[PDB]
Every structure is written in C-alpha cells, then in structure tokens.
Amino acid sequence: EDENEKMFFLIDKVNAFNQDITALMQGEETVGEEDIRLFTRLR
Amino acid sequence: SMEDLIPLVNRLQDAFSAIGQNADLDLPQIAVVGGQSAGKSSVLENFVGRDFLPRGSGIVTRRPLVLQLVNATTEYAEFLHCKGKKFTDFEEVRLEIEAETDRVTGTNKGISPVPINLRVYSPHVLNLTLVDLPGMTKVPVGDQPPDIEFQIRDMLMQFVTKENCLILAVSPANSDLANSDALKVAKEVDPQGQRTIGVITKLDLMDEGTDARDVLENKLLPLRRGYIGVVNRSQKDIDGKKDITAALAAERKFFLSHPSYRHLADRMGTPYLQKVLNQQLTNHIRDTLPGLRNKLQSQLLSIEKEVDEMLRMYHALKEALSIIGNINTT
Amino acid sequence: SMEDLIPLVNRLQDAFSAIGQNADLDLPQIAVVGGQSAGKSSVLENFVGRDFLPRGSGIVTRRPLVLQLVNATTEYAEFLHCKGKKFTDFEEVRLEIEAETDRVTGTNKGISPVPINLRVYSPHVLNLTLVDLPGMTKVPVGDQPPDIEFQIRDMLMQFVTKENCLILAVSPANSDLANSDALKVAKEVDPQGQRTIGVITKLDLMDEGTDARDVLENKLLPLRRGYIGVVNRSQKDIDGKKDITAALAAERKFFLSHPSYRHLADRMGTPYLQKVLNQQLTNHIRDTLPGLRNKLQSQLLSIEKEVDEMLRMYHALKEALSIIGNINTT
Known part of the structure; x- marks a missing residue:
C-alpha cells in the first residue's frame, strides 16, 4: 500500500523531535562544537 | 553474443543522452x-x-x-x-x-x-x-x-x-621467428591466450634452415587456442593492387610442406582467427552496466515517499532503468 | 574615406598578385x-x-x-x-x-x-x-x-x-541593456571602446521603458566609434528563416519615423553601420604601407649578382611601388 508507505515518512519524524526534548530537560542534550549546555549556564 | 550486443550498445547511449549525463561504455x-x-x-x-x-x-x-x-x-x-x-x-x-x-x-x-x-x-x-x-x-x-x-x-x-x-599479432619472416615482435607483445598482455592467437605470416619467405618447431606445435608453451598461421599478400601482390579475396588463395600452398604446421592444418587460416576475437569484446561492455542501474533506483525512492512534487525525476529515471535491464539479461 | 577604402584595397592586392608575393594588408x-x-x-x-x-x-x-x-x-x-x-x-x-x-x-x-x-x-x-x-x-x-x-x-x-x-557586442532588446552578457565582456577587456562598436538590435520589440536616443548621439556611455542602431531578426524570425531584404527594409524605415531619432536619421541603418566597421579598417591599412615597399626592393639584388636567370622578378617589383603611392595620397 502507498497509504502505508506515506504513513512511514511523516509519522517517523514527529517522534524524533519529542525524544530530544527529554534530553533538553535533563542537562544531557547534544550541543554545538564549543557551546555550553543550558543547565550549566544557569548555574 | 556479439550479434545481440551490437544493437543494444547503441540503444544504451540514447537512454544516457536523455539523463543528460556524460556516460559512455568506452568500447575497448x-x-x-x-x-x-x-x-x-x-x-x-x-x-x-x-x-x-x-x-x-x-x-x-x-x-x-x-x-x-x-x-x-x-x-x-x-x-x-x-x-x-x-x-x-x-x-x-x-x-x-x-x-x-x-x-x-x-x-x-x-x-x-x-x-x-x-x-x-x-x-x-x-x-x-x-x-x-x-x-x-x-x-x-x-x-x-x-x-x-x-x-x-x-x-x-x-x-x-x-x-x-x-x-x-603479425610476425615477419625476414626477422628471426623466436625474436618475434608480434609474439612478444601478445604474450605480455594476455599470457593464457583467451584473446591472443599467435599468427606467423609471410611463411613462404622464411630464411632456409630456421623454424620455431616446439612453440608452433603448441607443446613448448601450450596455449588454449594454440597458433593459427596465415600467408598474406606478398610484395608482388601489394604492387599490383591484388584484391582481398585473392590473398587467401596463396596461403594454402605453403602450409602443406612446413613440418611444424601440417598436423594442425585444420586450425589454420585468416577466417578462423576472426571467430575467436569477437567473443572477448562483448564481456567488457556488460560489466559496467550494473553499477549505473543501482544509482538510478536510489534517486527515485526519496522523493516518492514524501510526495517532493519534483515528479519529473520519476519519468526520466524509469526510462534509463528499462534499457539497462534488457542488456543485462542479454 | 568610405569611397576610398573599398577600391584601394583591391588595387593594392592585385598588383601584389602579379609579383607572386604573399603581401596582404592584414585587415583586423x-x-x-x-x-x-x-x-x-x-x-x-x-x-x-x-x-x-x-x-x-x-x-x-x-x-x-x-x-x-x-x-x-x-x-x-x-x-x-x-x-x-x-x-x-x-x-x-x-x-x-x-x-x-x-x-x-x-x-x-x-x-x-x-x-x-x-x-x-x-x-x-x-x-x-x-x-x-x-x-x-x-x-x-x-x-x-x-x-x-x-x-x-x-x-x-x-x-x-x-x-x-x-x-x-550584440544585445537582445527583450532583456535590459545592463544585464547584457555581450556588454559585460566587452566592458571588461576594452572598457573605453577603442575597438568596441556597440550594436543594439530588435528596436521594434524593445520592452517599454528603454530607448537608444542618448546612446546613438554618444552621450549615455560614450564609445570612441559610437553606437549604430539596428533592427535585426528576432528569435521567432530566425526560426522562420526571414530573409535579408525583409529585415533590412523594416530596419531602415524604423529610424525615419521614430520621434527620438529622425533628425539623426542620416547616420542610421545598414549604410552607416557599414561605414563604421570599414572606418576602423582604413586606419590600420595606411600605417602598414611602408613596410611592404621595402621588402620588394631587397629581393631583386640577391639573385641578379649570383646569375638565377629569374629576371621576371625585376619587372614585377617596379609595378608594385606605383600602387602603394596612390593609397597613401588617398
């Protein structure tokens, strides 16, 4: 099915964004080459 | 395989043209x-x-x-x-x-x-x-x-x-047969003789008292296809504008007397040399074709699943793949 | 100088021909x-x-x-x-x-x-x-x-x-003059126009909001030999194989009726454009004339003293010198 095919692309993307949010809340997020994580700058 | 390859090769170039890529078979x-x-x-x-x-x-x-x-x-x-x-x-x-x-x-x-x-x-x-x-x-x-x-x-x-x-590989009789320019070059590139046929020409003019007998009997250094001799146009022949068919007629006479070739007489002539060479050529063409086919498959997929609205790709790519497939099946 | 340029070039070459020497004006x-x-x-x-x-x-x-x-x-x-x-x-x-x-x-x-x-x-x-x-x-x-x-x-x-x-430097009227690919290159190599002759075509199809009035009076962006206006074939025209007479006739007529060009009509068309290109040739021609004259004198001397029996040279040379003078006088 082409309906199934179409479901894979959109449905997969939306979750991945949310998972990174979880990292952001815990001072674990992936950060740029010489940036500092949000949690440390607050301290 | 030569007969079916010829038309397919021209067809393949046309498909390539449509893609707007500089892609050639590079025939050897x-x-x-x-x-x-x-x-x-x-x-x-x-x-x-x-x-x-x-x-x-x-x-x-x-x-x-x-x-x-x-x-x-x-x-x-x-x-x-x-x-x-x-x-x-x-x-x-x-x-x-x-x-x-x-x-x-x-x-x-x-x-x-x-x-x-x-x-x-x-x-x-x-x-x-x-x-x-x-x-x-x-x-x-x-x-x-x-x-x-x-x-x-x-x-x-x-x-x-x-x-x-x-x-x-043509080898002149007015030089020593073991010192053969033809046989040297031929052996260097393709030692086993899948596409090398050792040919000694002008056999009727060789200096009295020399021969390559062991080599020419296909025993000294055995080759799968052996050796096929030919006797081509002589000095009188070239001078006269002797035509193509005529030259072959002179060949027959020599071969019956030469000790090193009479037992292999049925595997002699120009015409027999022809047959072998064609077969090798075809192999090269085909080998390059799988690589292209795969690239084309990959490009199409991406846009289709997200349908990018760049539907022009779909049609172009489809065409190329069909041509490739037919050559691959032979 | 327009009348003097055509015939004098043919006359000088003709004399050279009789001598059988490779002597040319080398028109740029x-x-x-x-x-x-x-x-x-x-x-x-x-x-x-x-x-x-x-x-x-x-x-x-x-x-x-x-x-x-x-x-x-x-x-x-x-x-x-x-x-x-x-x-x-x-x-x-x-x-x-x-x-x-x-x-x-x-x-x-x-x-x-x-x-x-x-x-x-x-x-x-x-x-x-x-x-x-x-x-x-x-x-x-x-x-x-x-x-x-x-x-x-x-x-x-x-x-x-x-x-x-x-x-x-040819520029299509259906694109702005500033975006001209032709004009870009010309301005890069010879910005002042010592050898650039600006030719603007398609006067009848030009987008509203452009004009050649300043350009042809040598006012907007001055060139040494100026600008000559033309109404040439369009892309539609070239596809249809519009012939020469037709294009030339509508082109000349155009300049006589246009309010912005009628007083300058006599320095427009095929006749004037022709004049301009020839005009550049004329300058080079004259300057080159001493060099040839000398060569001819020298040649005669050598062979005569070593007597080659090529006395034909002697007479040929005399002829050339007269022709040269007339071009110098104009």
Missing part, C-alpha cells in the same frame, strides 16, 4: 602490430570488411592511423586535417588516406610519429578504435637510421598496453 | 559575442550580404568559423576541406559547417576550439576576417559538461583579446 580498442612490411594493413582491413588501408612497397605503415568508427546512417569518411571534405566513393577514400602518408614521409622508406585522424561512419559498426602501426625492425633498411628500431617500437607500445586490446 | 578581424538568442550570426552575415551562417536557439555553433571574405564576381562559397566542390546553395553551405564539426567533436553535441575554414566570395566585400562564435548557454546538451557556458566563454576570449579585434 583493437590494435594491429607487426614487423616492417608484415601485411599488417591487410589483416586489419580484412576484419573490417573494406579496402581503406594504404599498402605499398618497402615500408607500408608509415604513420599511425587512429580510426574511430561511428554509427551513422550515411557511408563516408572525413579527416581531422581536412575539415569538411566530401568524397562518397570508397575507392577514393583509400586513395586519399594513402596520399596523406606520402605527404610527410615520401615513398623512400619513411617514418613519422604524427597520427592521421580518420572518422569512418557506417550503420553496421561498433564505436571502436583501431590502430595501424609502423613496423618494428631489427636492422636498418633504405635510409633509416641505426636506431630505427627504438623510434618505431615506442610509438606502438602506447596502444597495445591498453586493457582489452585484441592484438593482431 | 571582427568577432561577434553575446548570450544565446542575441542575434550574433545575423549581425555579421547581414554585413556580408548573404544568409550562410548557422543561426540559433539551443547550442548550434559548436566550433568557431574563421571566414575570409574575398572580392570576386560570382557569389558562392567553398570549404578548404572540400577541394573542388562549388556550392551554389547557401543553405547547403550552412549545413556543411554543422557536418564538418561532427567530424572532429563526434555527433553527440561536442565542441572544439579548432576553427573550420570557409571562404565566401562576393563583390561587396573587402578582404577581411570575420568570426562567428558559439553563444553563451544555460543548460548542457549531449555530452557537454555542466560548465559548458564557461568553456564557450573561453573560446571567444582567445579571439577578442587579439589586438585590433572589433567586438560586435
């Missing part, structure tokens, strides 16, 4: 080599099926001729150095090619490293590259310098090392 | 450059007075064509590479140029910087050298690389850098 070239006066031009033109190679007295191949064959509807020829020139008479074509060689070297033992460039269009040919090369020697003749051997030798070596070069 | 060459669909071929060939150059949409001219114009009674052309063939059909001439390109570049849209040599004889020309060049493009075709545009740019740069090359 075939080069004819041999001592001075060997009959080199005779051998080559017999394969092509036409009289177009200059032949003469003394030194015959006096300049290399790099001919590229081009599939086209009309039958004619054109020189790189003669922009725009129209013949239409193939006997005239032969004459013109010959004339250009005389232009630089004369007919007094010659030599020049500068290639003559010729495009021969025909609708029944492969886009191939064939090369007529100056005859290598061991001793100077006429006004050639003492180091004639070294100038000529280098020149032809640049063509025959090219991977997949069917070697028309 | 003119090369036409511009984006695709500028009208490049049209401008040049209209000066010559014949339809014989391949003209455009897509990539057409794939090799430069170096044409030498020859004063002669009959109107026809023949190519150096086609000895003996006399074309009487100029459409056939056009076609032949295309075919000749295939010979060297192959038949999948290839290009080569090597010129095809053609001589077009007519009685309405100076013995000059004109050059038709490939247009600038946006998309590749056949086996042309992705950077085809820049390669073609290079090709014309080798002609336009040549000292004394009148650049016919």
Whole structure:
C-alpha cells in the first residue's frame, strides 16, 4: 500500500523531535562544537 | 553474443543522452602490430570488411592511423586535417588516406610519429578504435637510421598496453621467428591466450634452415587456442593492387610442406582467427552496466515517499532503468 | 574615406598578385559575442550580404568559423576541406559547417576550439576576417559538461583579446541593456571602446521603458566609434528563416519615423553601420604601407649578382611601388 508507505515518512519524524526534548530537560542534550549546555549556564 | 550486443550498445547511449549525463561504455580498442612490411594493413582491413588501408612497397605503415568508427546512417569518411571534405566513393577514400602518408614521409622508406585522424561512419559498426602501426625492425633498411628500431617500437607500445586490446599479432619472416615482435607483445598482455592467437605470416619467405618447431606445435608453451598461421599478400601482390579475396588463395600452398604446421592444418587460416576475437569484446561492455542501474533506483525512492512534487525525476529515471535491464539479461 | 577604402584595397592586392608575393594588408578581424538568442550570426552575415551562417536557439555553433571574405564576381562559397566542390546553395553551405564539426567533436553535441575554414566570395566585400562564435548557454546538451557556458566563454576570449579585434557586442532588446552578457565582456577587456562598436538590435520589440536616443548621439556611455542602431531578426524570425531584404527594409524605415531619432536619421541603418566597421579598417591599412615597399626592393639584388636567370622578378617589383603611392595620397 502507498497509504502505508506515506504513513512511514511523516509519522517517523514527529517522534524524533519529542525524544530530544527529554534530553533538553535533563542537562544531557547534544550541543554545538564549543557551546555550553543550558543547565550549566544557569548555574 | 556479439550479434545481440551490437544493437543494444547503441540503444544504451540514447537512454544516457536523455539523463543528460556524460556516460559512455568506452568500447575497448583493437590494435594491429607487426614487423616492417608484415601485411599488417591487410589483416586489419580484412576484419573490417573494406579496402581503406594504404599498402605499398618497402615500408607500408608509415604513420599511425587512429580510426574511430561511428554509427551513422550515411557511408563516408572525413579527416581531422581536412575539415569538411566530401568524397562518397570508397575507392577514393583509400586513395586519399594513402596520399596523406606520402605527404610527410615520401615513398623512400619513411617514418613519422604524427597520427592521421580518420572518422569512418557506417550503420553496421561498433564505436571502436583501431590502430595501424609502423613496423618494428631489427636492422636498418633504405635510409633509416641505426636506431630505427627504438623510434618505431615506442610509438606502438602506447596502444597495445591498453586493457582489452585484441592484438593482431603479425610476425615477419625476414626477422628471426623466436625474436618475434608480434609474439612478444601478445604474450605480455594476455599470457593464457583467451584473446591472443599467435599468427606467423609471410611463411613462404622464411630464411632456409630456421623454424620455431616446439612453440608452433603448441607443446613448448601450450596455449588454449594454440597458433593459427596465415600467408598474406606478398610484395608482388601489394604492387599490383591484388584484391582481398585473392590473398587467401596463396596461403594454402605453403602450409602443406612446413613440418611444424601440417598436423594442425585444420586450425589454420585468416577466417578462423576472426571467430575467436569477437567473443572477448562483448564481456567488457556488460560489466559496467550494473553499477549505473543501482544509482538510478536510489534517486527515485526519496522523493516518492514524501510526495517532493519534483515528479519529473520519476519519468526520466524509469526510462534509463528499462534499457539497462534488457542488456543485462542479454 | 568610405569611397576610398573599398577600391584601394583591391588595387593594392592585385598588383601584389602579379609579383607572386604573399603581401596582404592584414585587415583586423571582427568577432561577434553575446548570450544565446542575441542575434550574433545575423549581425555579421547581414554585413556580408548573404544568409550562410548557422543561426540559433539551443547550442548550434559548436566550433568557431574563421571566414575570409574575398572580392570576386560570382557569389558562392567553398570549404578548404572540400577541394573542388562549388556550392551554389547557401543553405547547403550552412549545413556543411554543422557536418564538418561532427567530424572532429563526434555527433553527440561536442565542441572544439579548432576553427573550420570557409571562404565566401562576393563583390561587396573587402578582404577581411570575420568570426562567428558559439553563444553563451544555460543548460548542457549531449555530452557537454555542466560548465559548458564557461568553456564557450573561453573560446571567444582567445579571439577578442587579439589586438585590433572589433567586438560586435550584440544585445537582445527583450532583456535590459545592463544585464547584457555581450556588454559585460566587452566592458571588461576594452572598457573605453577603442575597438568596441556597440550594436543594439530588435528596436521594434524593445520592452517599454528603454530607448537608444542618448546612446546613438554618444552621450549615455560614450564609445570612441559610437553606437549604430539596428533592427535585426528576432528569435521567432530566425526560426522562420526571414530573409535579408525583409529585415533590412523594416530596419531602415524604423529610424525615419521614430520621434527620438529622425533628425539623426542620416547616420542610421545598414549604410552607416557599414561605414563604421570599414572606418576602423582604413586606419590600420595606411600605417602598414611602408613596410611592404621595402621588402620588394631587397629581393631583386640577391639573385641578379649570383646569375638565377629569374629576371621576371625585376619587372614585377617596379609595378608594385606605383600602387602603394596612390593609397597613401588617398
């Protein structure tokens, strides 16, 4: 099915964004080459 | 396999054109080599099926001729150095090619490293590259310098090392048979003889008292395809404009007496050499085709699942894949 | 000086002919450059007075064509590479140029910087050298690389850098004059216009909001020899094979009715444009005249003292000197 095919692309993307949010809340997020994580700058 | 390959190769180029990619099969070239006066031009033109190679007295191949064959509807020829020139008479074509060689070297033992460039269009040919090369020697003749051997030798070596070069190995009787220019080059590139046929020409002129007997019996150094001999046009023959069919007739006479070849008589002649060479050529073409096919599959997929609205790809790619498939199945 | 230029050039060459010496004025060459669909071929060939150059949409001219114009009674052309063939059909001439390109570049849209040599004889020309060049493009075709545009740019740069090359900077009226590909290049190499003659075509189709009034009075962006206005064939026209007489007639008429140009009407058209290009030639011609005179005197002396029995030289030389004087006086 082409309906199934179409479901894979959109449905997969939306979750991945949310998972990174979880990292952001815990001072674990992936950060740029010489940036500092949000949690440390607050301290 | 040669018969089915020919049309498919032209079709494949057309599909490529549509993609707007510079993608070619790069058909392997075939080069004819041999001592001075060997009959080199005779051998080559017999394969092509036409009289177009200059032949003469003394030194015959006096300049290399790099001919590229081009599939086209009309039958004619054109020189790189003669922009725009129209013949239409193939006997005239032969004459013109010959004339250009005389232009630089004369007919007094010659030599020049500068290639003559010729495009021969025909609708029944492969886009191939064939090369007529100056005859290598061991001793100077006429006004050639003492180091004639070294100038000529280098020149032809640049063509025959090219991977997949069917070697028309012609070997002159007026040089020692074990010192064969043809057999040396042929053995260097393709030792097992899948596409090398050792050919000893001009057998009727060999000096009394010499022979290569063990080698020529296919025992000394056994080759799968062995050796096939031929007797090509003699000096009288070239002088007269003796035509193609005629030359083959002289061959028969010699072979019945020579001790080293009578037991292998049924595996002799020009015609038998023809059959073998064609088979190897086909292999190269096919090998390159899988790689392209795969690339095309990958490109299409991406846009389709996200349908990018760049639907133009879909149609272009589909076309290419069909052509590729048919060649792959044979 | 317009009346003096044509006949004096033929007269001087004719005297030279009798001596049998290679003595020419070496009239500077003119090369036409511009984006695709500028009208490049049209401008040049209209000066010559014949339809014989391949003209455009897509990539057409794939090799430069170096044409030498020859004063002669009959109107026809023949190519150096086609000895003996006399074309009487100029459409056939056009076609032949295309075919000749295939010979060297192959038949999948290839290009080569090597010129095809053609001589077009007519009685309405100076013995000059004109050059038709490939247009600038946006998309590749056949086996042309992705950077085809820049390669073609290079090709014309080798002609336009040549000292004394009148650049016919051709610009289509359906694009703004500032965005002209032709004008960009011209301004890069010869910004002040010591050898640039600005030619603006398609006066009847120009987008509203542009005009040539300042340009032709040498006011907006001054050039040494100024600007000559023209109304040439459009892309639609070239496709339809609109002939010379028709284009020329509507062009001249245009300038007489336009409010912005009528008082300057007498320095407009084919007649004036012709005048301008010839005018540049005239300056070079005169300056070169001392050099030849001297050569002729010297030659005589040598052979006579070593008496070659070539006393014919003696008489020939005397003749040349008279002709030279008349050109110097004007």
